[PDB]
Amino acid sequence: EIRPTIGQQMETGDQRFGDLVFRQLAPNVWQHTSYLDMPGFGAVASNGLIVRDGGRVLVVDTAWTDDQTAQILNWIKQEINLPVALAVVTHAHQDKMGGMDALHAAGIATYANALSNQLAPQEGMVAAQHSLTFAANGWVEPATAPNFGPLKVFYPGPGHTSDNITVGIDGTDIAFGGCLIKDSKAKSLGNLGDADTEHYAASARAFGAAFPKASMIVMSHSAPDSRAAITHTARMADKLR
Length: 241
Ligand SMILES: Nc1nc(C(=O)O)c(CCc2ccccc2)s1
Ligand SMILES: [Zn+2]
Ligand SMILES: [Zn+2]
What we know:
The chain has helices at 66-79, 94-97, 100-105, 114-119, 200-210, 228-238; strands at 14-17, 20-26, 29-38, 42-53, 56-60, 84-89, 109-113, 130-132, 151-154, 166-169, 174-178, 216-219. By secondary structure, the chain is α/β, with parallel strands linked by helices. It has one domain (14-238): 4-Layer Sandwich (Metallo-beta-lactamase, Chain A), CATH 3.60.15.10. Strands 1-2-3-4-5-6-7-8 form an 8-stranded mixed sheet. The chain has a 4-stranded mixed sheet with strand order 9-10-11-12, with no helix packed on it. Helix 5 packs antiparallel against helix 6. The longest helix has 14 residues, at 66-79. The chain is globular and about 45 Å long. Bound molecules: 2-azanyl-5-(2-phenylethyl)-1,3-thiazole-4-carboxylic acid and zinc ion (2 copies). One zinc ion (ZN) is lined by residues 91, 93, 160-161, 179.
C-alpha cells in the first residue's frame, strides 16, 4: 500500500517512486500521483501531468507538498533527464499548488490563472510567478502563455472553484480536467466547499466543448476515464441548482 482511501489504486503499468506513483498515459505523457495522509481517514490521491515536448518537460500541477514535488522533479531527472521548462498549476488548493516552493527553488517558471495568484495568499500558499488571463469564451490569452508547446489552457468557468483551469494536450487525445471533473462512477463531486454550484454544470460542459475530440479525460482524484466523466460530472452538477 499504495492503497489510498480516495483516488485510483495501483494497477499494472504503475511505477512507484519514493512516495509517489507514475503512470505513462501516452508516449510523451505521464500522470503523477501523490498522497496526503488524513488522520482517521487514510490517504487521498491527487494527480497531475508530465509532458515531454522535444528537449524539455512541462508539468501540470504540483504534489500536495514541497518534498513530494521535489520527488516529481527527481523522477523526471531519472526517467527523462530533460529540463523542466515550466509548470502550470490549475487552482489555489493544496493538491495543486502545495509544492510551489520546490518548483521555484529548482528554477522552474510557474504559471497560474491570475485569479489563482490573487487567491493563493489567502489560502496560505505561494502564487505562481506568472499570471494567465483568459478570453470571454475561456481560451487563454496566448501572450500570457508563451512557449507552452502542446499545453492548451482553457478556463471553463467557475465550478469546483472560481479559478479552476483545464489543460488539453495538443497532439494527443488527452485533456486534463483537474478538480473540476470527477469520474463516471463517482457518487459525489468531491469537495464543494469553494464551489460555484450555480455555474458548475455549464463549466463542466464548457470543458467538454473546448476539447471535443479528447477521448481520455485525466482528473485530480481518479484514474483517467472516458468522456463519460464529463457528462456524469455535468449531470451531478445539474442537481446542485
Ligand atoms: N484536496 C481535495 N480535493 C478534493 C476535490 O474534490 O478536488 C477532495 C475530495 C476528494 C473526492 C473526490 C471525489 C469523490 C470523493 C472525494 S480533497
Ligand atoms: Zn480544489
Ligand atoms: Zn482537489
